[PDB]
Amino acid sequence: DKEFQVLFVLTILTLISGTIFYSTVEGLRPIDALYFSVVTLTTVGCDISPQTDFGKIFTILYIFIGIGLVAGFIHKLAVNVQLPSILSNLVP
Amino acid sequence: DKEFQVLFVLTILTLISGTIFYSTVEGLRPIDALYFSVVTLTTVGCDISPQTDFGKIFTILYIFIGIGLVAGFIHKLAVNVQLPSILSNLVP
Amino acid sequence: DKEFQVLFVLTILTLISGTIFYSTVEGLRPIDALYFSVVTLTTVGCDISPQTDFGKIFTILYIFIGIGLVAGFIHKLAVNVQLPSILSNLVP
Amino acid sequence: DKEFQVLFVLTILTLISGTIFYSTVEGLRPIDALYFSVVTLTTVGCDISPQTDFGKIFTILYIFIGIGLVAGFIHKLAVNVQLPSILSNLVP
Numbered sequence: 001d002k003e004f005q006v007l008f009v010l011t012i013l014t015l016i017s018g019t020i021f022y023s024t025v026e027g028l029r030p031i032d033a034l035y036f037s038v039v040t041l042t043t044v045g046c047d048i049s050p051q052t053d054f055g056k057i058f059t060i061l062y063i064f065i066g067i068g069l070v071a072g073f074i075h076k077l078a079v080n081v082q083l084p085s086i087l088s089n090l091v092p
Numbered sequence: 093d094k095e096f097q098v099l100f101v102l103t104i105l106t107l108i109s110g111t112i113f114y115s116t117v118e119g120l121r122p123i124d125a126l127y128f129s130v131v132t133l134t135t136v137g138c139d140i141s142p143q144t145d146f147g148k149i150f151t152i153l154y155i156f157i158g159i160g161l162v163a164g165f166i167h168k169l170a171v172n173v174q175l176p177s178i179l180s181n182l183v184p
Numbered sequence: 185d186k187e188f189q190v191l192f193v194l195t196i197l198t199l200i201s202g203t204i205f206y207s208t209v210e211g212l213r214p215i216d217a218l219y220f221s222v223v224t225l226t227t228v229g230c231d232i233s234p235q236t237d238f239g240k241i242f243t244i245l246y247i248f249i250g251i252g253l254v255a256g257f258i259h260k261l262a263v264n265v266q267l268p269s270i271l272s273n274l275v276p
Numbered sequence: 277d278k279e280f281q282v283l284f285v286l287t288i289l290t291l292i293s294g295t296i297f298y299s300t301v302e303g304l305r306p307i308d309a310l311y312f313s314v315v316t317l318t319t320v321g322c323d324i325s326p327q328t329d330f331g332k333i334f335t336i337l338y339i340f341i342g343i344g345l346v347a348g349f350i351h352k353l354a355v356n357v358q359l360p361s362i363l364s365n366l367v368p
């Protein structure tokens with residue numbers, strides 16, 4: 001499934017970029033920076049906000065450019081990969 | 093309505109898993125753990141974040157795997173079960 | 185536009201119910217209770233969480249039953265009512 | 277691509293309006309006011325809430341009127357402008 005892999009690669013790259021940015025500029029531990037990237041792009045959010053003007057501007061751009069991609073990835077992780085499995089049982 | 097029941101079962105199982113995980117690893121009361129699972133997977137969020145690295149990693153995986161499912165469930169709870177009722181009045 | 189009015193009425197009723205519930209059980213001012221209802225059902229969220237077990241259970245049910253409705257309402261407020269206006273200028 | 281530009285213009289105007297409102301009434305720095313507008317309309321949210329009744333009422337209206345628009349803009353920024361680029365490599 002190429003599109004799955006493609007959306008996966010772009011998401012991975014997006015999250016790597018976010019992890020690097022927030023670990024460097026906002027000073028988060030790598031794991032916390034990946035968490036922040038993930039909850040931002042899925043719109044889940046969390047209890048902290050960037051506190052540098054650079055972090056705020058980057059987050060604005062990051063959100064606008066990443067939400068669509070991660071939403072597409074979540075969609076296919078659910079429908080091209082998850083739906084079939086569901087049918088694997090509910091029909092004999 | 094099979095698909096409704098199926099989405100319902102998978103959602104229940106997802107939420108049970110989350111309740112168990114967050115009550116065990118993050119140490120939340122069962123009710124708070126279910127709340128956290130629910131607001132996470134609907135992307136509503138809340139004022140607390142996991143504070144163990146295990147909780148953060150699990151939440152990343154949980155979000156990615158659960159959002160699609162709960163969104164589908166919410167869709168059908170609204171359209172295969174809620175829309176008809178609406179027509180039950182607005183047309184004689 | 186009937187469906188607009190219908191989605192509007194159901195949303196109003198949903199928000200009224202939320203305002204009453206959160207002003208009574210969580211003890212919020214009416215305006216804060218309406219804010220909480222609105223940011224919950226649009227998944228925007230805010231910096232506070234219900235602190236009674238009754239408020240948490242109600243919010244779980246409220247979210248599951250209301251998000252679909254408000255999403256439909258937001259969709260039509262944007263497409264059956266907002267899109268035409270946009271065309272009102274960008275084409276002579 | 278006209279629709280892209282149109283959605284872009286309406287989004288810019290929406291965000292400008294939010295920046296002005298929150299910098300004036302809630303007293304946020306311009307950059308923080310734009311951040312608040314952006315995380316509100318993308319439903320990402322943040323760790324602060326308006327504290328004037330005027331800010332709460334405006335945010336209710338702002339959300340209802342803006343979410344649809346920004347969602348459409350995010351969609352096209354991802355599909356009319358981002359998808360082609362993706363094909364630019366994954367096919368020779």
Ligand SMILES: [Cs+]
Nearest residue numbers: 044045320321
């Ligand atoms: Cs959120």
Ligand SMILES: [K+]
Nearest residue numbers: 048049050051
């Ligand atoms: K901050």
Ligand SMILES: [K+]
Nearest residue numbers: 043135227319
């Ligand atoms: K959200």
Ligand SMILES: [K+]
Nearest residue numbers: 046138230322
């Ligand atoms: K929050």
Ligand SMILES: [K+]
Nearest residue numbers: 140141142143
């Ligand atoms: K934390």
Ligand SMILES: [K+]
Nearest residue numbers: 043135227319
């Ligand atoms: K959302």
Ligand SMILES: [K+]
Nearest residue numbers: 232233234235
């Ligand atoms: K609380």
Ligand SMILES: [K+]
Nearest residue numbers: 324325326327
């Ligand atoms: K506040």
